[PDB]
Design a protein around this ligand. Sequence first.
Ligand SMILES: CC(C)CCC[C@@H](C)[C@H]1CC[C@H]2[C@@H]3CC=C4C[C@@H](O)CC[C@]4(C)[C@H]3CC[C@]12C
Ligand SMILES: CC(C)CCC[C@@H](C)[C@H]1CC[C@H]2[C@@H]3CC=C4C[C@@H](O)CC[C@]4(C)[C@H]3CC[C@]12C
Ligand SMILES: CC(C)CCC[C@@H](C)[C@H]1CC[C@H]2[C@@H]3CC=C4C[C@@H](O)CC[C@]4(C)[C@H]3CC[C@]12C
Ligand SMILES: CC(C)CCC[C@@H](C)[C@H]1CC[C@H]2[C@@H]3CC=C4C[C@@H](O)CC[C@]4(C)[C@H]3CC[C@]12C
Ligand SMILES: CC(C)CCC[C@@H](C)[C@H]1CC[C@H]2[C@@H]3CC=C4C[C@@H](O)CC[C@]4(C)[C@H]3CC[C@]12C
Ligand SMILES: CCCCCCCCCCCCCCCC(=O)O
Ligand SMILES: CCCCCCCCCCCCCCCC(=O)O
Ligand SMILES: CCCCCCCCCCCCCCCC(=O)O
Ligand SMILES: CCCCCCCCCCCCCCCC(=O)O
Ligand SMILES: CCCCCCCCCCCCCCCC(=O)O
Ligand SMILES: CCCCCCCCCCCCCCCC(=O)O
Ligand SMILES: CCCCCCCCCCCCCCCC(=O)O
Ligand SMILES: CCCCCCCCCCCCCCCC(=O)O
Ligand SMILES: CCCCCCCCCCCCCCCC(=O)O
Ligand SMILES: CCCCCCCCCCCCCCCC(=O)O
Ligand SMILES: CCCCCCCCCCCCCCCC(=O)O
Ligand SMILES: CCCCCCCCCCCCCCCC(=O)O
Lengths: 57, 289, 289, 338, 221, 19, 7, 7
Amino acid sequence: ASIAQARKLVEQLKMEANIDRIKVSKAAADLMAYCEAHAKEDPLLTPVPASENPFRE
Amino acid sequence: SLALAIAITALYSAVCAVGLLGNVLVMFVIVRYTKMKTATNIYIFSLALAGALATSTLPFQSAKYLMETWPFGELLCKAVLSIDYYSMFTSIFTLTMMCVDRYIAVCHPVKALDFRTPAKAKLINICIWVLASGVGVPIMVMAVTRPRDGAVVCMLQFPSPSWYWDTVTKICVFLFAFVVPILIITVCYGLMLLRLRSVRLLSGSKEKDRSLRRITRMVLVVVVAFVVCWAPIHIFVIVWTLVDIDRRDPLVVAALHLCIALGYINSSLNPVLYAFLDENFKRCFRQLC
Amino acid sequence: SLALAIAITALYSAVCAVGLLGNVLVMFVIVRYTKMKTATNIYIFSLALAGALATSTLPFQSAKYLMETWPFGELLCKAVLSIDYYSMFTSIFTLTMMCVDRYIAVCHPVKALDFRTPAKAKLINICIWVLASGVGVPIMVMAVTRPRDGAVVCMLQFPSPSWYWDTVTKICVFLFAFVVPILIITVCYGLMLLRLRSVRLLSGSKEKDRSLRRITRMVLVVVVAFVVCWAPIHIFVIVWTLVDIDRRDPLVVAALHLCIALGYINSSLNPVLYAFLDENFKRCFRQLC
Amino acid sequence: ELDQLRQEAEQLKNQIRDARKACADATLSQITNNIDPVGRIQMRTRRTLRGHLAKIYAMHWGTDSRLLVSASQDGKLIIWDSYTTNKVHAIPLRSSWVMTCAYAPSGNYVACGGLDNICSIYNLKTREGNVRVSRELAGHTGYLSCCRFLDDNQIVTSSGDTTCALWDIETGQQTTTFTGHTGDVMSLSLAPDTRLFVSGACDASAKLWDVREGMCRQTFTGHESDINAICFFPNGNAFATGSDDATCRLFDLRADQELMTYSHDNIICGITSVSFSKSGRLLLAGYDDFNCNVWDALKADRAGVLAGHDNRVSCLGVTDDGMAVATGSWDSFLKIWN
Amino acid sequence: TLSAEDKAAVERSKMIDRNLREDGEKAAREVKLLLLGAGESGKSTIVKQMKITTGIVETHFTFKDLHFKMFDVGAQRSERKKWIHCFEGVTAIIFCVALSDYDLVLMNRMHESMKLFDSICNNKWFTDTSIILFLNKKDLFEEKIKKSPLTICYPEYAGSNTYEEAAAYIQCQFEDLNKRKDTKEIYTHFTCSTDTKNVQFVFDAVTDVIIKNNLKDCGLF
Amino acid sequence: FDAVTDVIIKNNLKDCGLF
Amino acid sequence: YXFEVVG
Amino acid sequence: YXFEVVG
Ligand SMILES: CC(C)CCC[C@@H](C)[C@H]1CC[C@H]2[C@@H]3CC=C4C[C@@H](O)CC[C@]4(C)[C@H]3CC[C@]12C
Ligand SMILES: CC(C)CCC[C@@H](C)[C@H]1CC[C@H]2[C@@H]3CC=C4C[C@@H](O)CC[C@]4(C)[C@H]3CC[C@]12C
Ligand SMILES: CC(C)CCC[C@@H](C)[C@H]1CC[C@H]2[C@@H]3CC=C4C[C@@H](O)CC[C@]4(C)[C@H]3CC[C@]12C
Ligand SMILES: CC(C)CCC[C@@H](C)[C@H]1CC[C@H]2[C@@H]3CC=C4C[C@@H](O)CC[C@]4(C)[C@H]3CC[C@]12C
Ligand SMILES: CC(C)CCC[C@@H](C)[C@H]1CC[C@H]2[C@@H]3CC=C4C[C@@H](O)CC[C@]4(C)[C@H]3CC[C@]12C
Ligand SMILES: CCCCCCCCCCCCCCCC(=O)O
Ligand SMILES: CCCCCCCCCCCCCCCC(=O)O
Ligand SMILES: CCCCCCCCCCCCCCCC(=O)O
Ligand SMILES: CCCCCCCCCCCCCCCC(=O)O
Ligand SMILES: CCCCCCCCCCCCCCCC(=O)O
Ligand SMILES: CCCCCCCCCCCCCCCC(=O)O
Ligand SMILES: CCCCCCCCCCCCCCCC(=O)O
Ligand SMILES: CCCCCCCCCCCCCCCC(=O)O
Ligand SMILES: CCCCCCCCCCCCCCCC(=O)O
Ligand SMILES: CCCCCCCCCCCCCCCC(=O)O
Ligand SMILES: CCCCCCCCCCCCCCCC(=O)O
Ligand SMILES: CCCCCCCCCCCCCCCC(=O)O
């Protein structure tokens, strides 16, 4: 029956509840650290010389 | 305004008088003197008869133009429209067969001996009149008389949509009465003129070249007159059918009557001119005088 | 006299300017925006290119009219006559094939899937441009420069008799450039209009009848404009060839330039007008604004 | 009993909402206020690819970045070469309707999915020379919306029957099935480690799935309409979603909540595709207004506008090295932007 | 400045491009028909009459040298809105409903058929797409209208219990759902097991649609 | 044959009346 | 020819 | 068309 799904579904919610959530400021700091650390590697963010660029006119 | 009306009425009266008298005189000279031996004179007789039949329509049209209404009735309206279309198609088909006969005479001389006989030419002309009756009958059936805006108008009644079948009718009349005869006459006369240069009598001397110039001019005058007369009335009638504007304006109606007058001039006066172009027709009057 | 000259020069300058600007704008919008996907727009591009090629000839003609002599030389005389005849035949054949394409599109829809493709339309247009060179080359060969009455005239030289070959040339150009395309266009459009009445979208309602009336007017405008523009120049030229009257008279020359101007009007103004008539072109302008 | 279970579920949802409210002390916009702006991102079309005679539904990038796969409505896959604009392979598919395509990391195989509901694995290394149909994966009862290779032997698929699946290519069986959505699942992405993936469905929620264990770990809500695209961040701790509500939103896995809402007043159309740059600083999104937009992922400002496509931009993708971004659209053109 | 292998790759690309153009030329001529309606409408009957993958069946048939591809999507249980835009490029939609549906009770089935027809007709993707409407189960309906009055399904209808009036009323009620009547014709036909004129009717409607598309292509309409 | 053909064409032109 | 258009 | 006659 549907209630047999319900007992399962609430249990699926239970596993979602028991999680060790961290502070959002630490995740934002890790996001800024990854963006600032890999900022020089990105070819879209930092322009590429024409000779180094594989795509040419 | 008033002078325009009297001028148009005088134009219709002059065209009717000169055309009717000329056609009667041409038919009289053909019957009395020629006796219809030549097939070409039989064709000229049929063309003059069709021209006189077209000419007869004009006084009713002039009377309608002056009265500004139609008091003659539905049956005579049917008769006028039927005679007009019948005579027009008969005249055009007769002229086309004249040009075909000249082409067969010049370009195919051996075949011309079998093909050109008075009995066959009379049979072809009778077939032309009988087939033109097939055109004539629906114009008689469709024609009706109705009162519009306090005045009575003679006109043709088309099935719904009236504008669509009217437009299709004008396009079909334009095609079969204008484009196909010009094509047949132009091709036949062009091949005839290309054939004529080989003839020893028409080439190699100044007088012979002048005779070839005369034959070329007499041939081309027919095509030039046919195009000049028939093209404006067909174009103006098609434009009239497409546009919806009121006929109250006098100038547009006057231009329309001028185009109708040019068409009747080609129907009536030009068979008389074609008769005068004939050398034998000149010879009969020269012998008489 | 003087005002007649300046008026005719202004007419030629206006027709040349508007024709060149309109043809360049039509070709620019077709290449830049349409990208030649539709075959009909490919035909419109070819027609506009032929119109611009015809329009380019006009300043030399106006300069000859003002100077009253030809100082440009034999080679440029040959170039002018060859470009004029080539562009005229290219424009007329392109318009005829456009009408044939519309006929095949409407009346034969199953066949239209095979027949109508951009590659085949480009192939047909390339065949038209190649075949028009067959007309163009003898005009280039025949054209010569001779001094007459203290003045230099650009003209075409014909073998003896000059008047005979010239007249045969006039009749052949008249037939193939006037009568046969009018026949093909009139028959194709007539069968198309007869087919269109069966369509449910065009019949059974007042708005649907208005749409059918709009399509009928757009179809017939092409035929009416073609006949009105091309008949006087052809008839006037043939009459000029037959009659031996001198060209000193200013009024006859003025009427001749009016007929030539009407022919260049059809050659240049009409393709641009056809582009304006097309709904897609209007849609592109509406989208831009 | 059923009412007690529903009330307990509502209380647990209220607990989750209270925990999310508690954890969200500060906003990403306040944190990233000190970083310099990116300025004007000026990208130009380098290579234009012609050949597709119908709408281009999907594209994927190879690991080498020299090979591009594309799927179109004419029933064909084309494997392009980005550098020289050459067609390396053309594959005529059995089913014309091709919603999704995928390219293997090794490059040995490709995949396609459609309204036929059967995924199709094709082998490119056949000694004969032509591409040969290798596997047909049947068993979904709805339309296949996305597929991504994990390796040469396993593939993950999402379908319109509200489920996802993990397929063993050699066995050809549905070893692991993912259930729990209530709407059509439209897209999925794969994390770099490939241990877990995310999916988005038409119930406006996204879900985190474990490949090995088959269970849902996290469920994220907040969108007001159907979620059409979902891509991971390069670190694997965050992901972005595009939806029909004219917004793109950033979700953190560890923080278990939304970080940023990307929206503009002029933009009222839906998002079809999203991808991050190599460093994650720029978020590129395709839209239904015939345009692509490059957003600064930290400031939520529209860095750049790309307008090369006449019709609806349906898909886009950034290469692994990050040199260029390809945009497939409904005007039957694949355009390279650099 | 290209190596021999690069030139061979360019030649391979040109060969592939030729195959793409040939396949596109072949595929351009295919008339596309989308088949819609309820499950018990009579779709299988229509396919059987015309003749004599789990989710979309495709039927190929040729009539008067015209190629027809018909796509029946009726096996799918997914939301129609998500995948409907793929079918934007089709020649016509054939929609089949059964006249006798109103008597059977699941609410009234005929109102569900009207809701389905209204949803397909008012869709933004199919503003200009023509609909060919088939009314199945004529023989059963003729007996049933005598057996059961039409007043139960429609209270507004007050006409007599005649087959001609009931058919001419169901037809006009279906036609009045079109909100773009000037641009979108609806082709209605009565379907029986015995008659074989359905194919001819589809060919005539498709021919009219192709003439419409050619008029739009030329730009006169 | 050719001369006889020319004579017949001459007679036909006289019969038509153009020549 | 043209009596029907003048009336 | 008609240049050949005007000169
Ligand atoms: C409008 C239509 C009906 C007018 C018809 C007029 C006809 C009937 C009249 C007018 C001219 C007449 C012809 C005038 C001259 C001759 C020559 C004579 O030796 C035989 C009779 C004949 C041939 C007449 C026959 C009848 C005729 C043709
Ligand atoms: C209004 C229309 C129908 C009237 C037509 C009148 C016709 C039928 C009449 C009137 C004039 C008649 C012609 C008068 C003269 C001749 C010459 C004669 O040697 C042969 C018969 C012939 C050629 C007649 C044939 C019939 C004829 C043409
Ligand atoms: C100049 C003359 C020959 C033109 C004659 C036009 C006649 C022949 C044409 C033009 C209009 C046509 C009619 C148009 C409409 C209908 C209704 C259709 O259900 C029966 C045929 C019928 C009645 C046509 C019969 C033929 C018709 C009358
Ligand atoms: C004397 C005659 C031959 C001159 C004819 C000049 C014609 C052929 C030339 C001059 C101007 C040219 C156009 C100028 C600009 C453009 C825009 C470009 O993006 C496509 C080509 C296009 C549309 C050209 C097409 C060819 C063109 C129209
Ligand atoms: C004096 C006359 C002969 C000059 C003729 C110039 C012709 C040959 C040249 C000038 C303009 C050119 C066209 C310019 C633009 C395009 C659009 C392109 O997508 C296809 C080629 C096409 C259609 C060119 C074909 C060749 C072309 C028409
Ligand atoms: C050669 C024969 C030509 C015959 C032409 C006759 C034309 C007569 C028309 C008379 C109209 C009389 C109108 C009276 C009313 C009014 O004052 O306008
Ligand atoms: C619509 C125009 C019709 C023109 C009809 C003329 C056709 C003439 C065909 C004659 C064929 C005989 C061979 C060519 C002529 C010849 O030299 O004998
Ligand atoms: C516009 C096209 C006209 C075609 C004219 C073809 C001319 C062919 C000429 C053949 C040689 C001359 C034959 C006749 C010689 C003569 O005058 O007796
Ligand atoms: C009322 C006027 C009607 C029209 C008059 C013009 C038609 C007649 C043309 C006569 C052609 C003369 C041919 C001359 C031949 C020659 O001698 O060279
Ligand atoms: C409306 C009337 C139509 C007339 C149709 C035929 C016109 C032919 C014109 C011929 C003009 C002849 C001028 C001769 C001048 C001269 O004396 O050399
Ligand atoms: C749209 C372009 C129009 C071009 C028109 C060009 C006309 C050139 C006319 C030149 C006339 C020269 C007359 C010189 C008279 C003198 O010697 O003073
Ligand atoms: C606009 C098109 C013009 C076409 C002009 C074609 C002219 C052809 C003339 C051919 C004359 C042949 C004369 C040959 C005489 C001989 O036998 O020596
Ligand atoms: C000079 C005229 C040019 C146009 C000629 C068109 C001829 C079309 C012939 C097609 C024959 C097919 C049967 C009739 C048409 C049809 O109903 O399908
Ligand atoms: C000038 C007349 C040309 C020939 C006209 C032929 C007309 C045939 C009509 C047949 C009956 C009508 C069939 C079409 C009815 C419709 O769907 O509108
Ligand atoms: C400078 C004038 C040039 C010629 C202008 C006339 C060509 C334009 C024709 C427009 C036709 C419009 C038809 C609309 C019919 C309708 O309203 O239903
Ligand atoms: C020299 C240019 C030739 C043009 C040939 C076609 C002419 C078409 C004229 C149509 C005029 C229509 C006027 C309608 C006015 C109105 O709507 O009230
Ligand atoms: C509504 C207006 C229609 C106009 C139709 C024009 C038909 C051709 C007219 C040709 C006139 C030629 C005049 C030549 C005069 C001359 O020979 O000198």
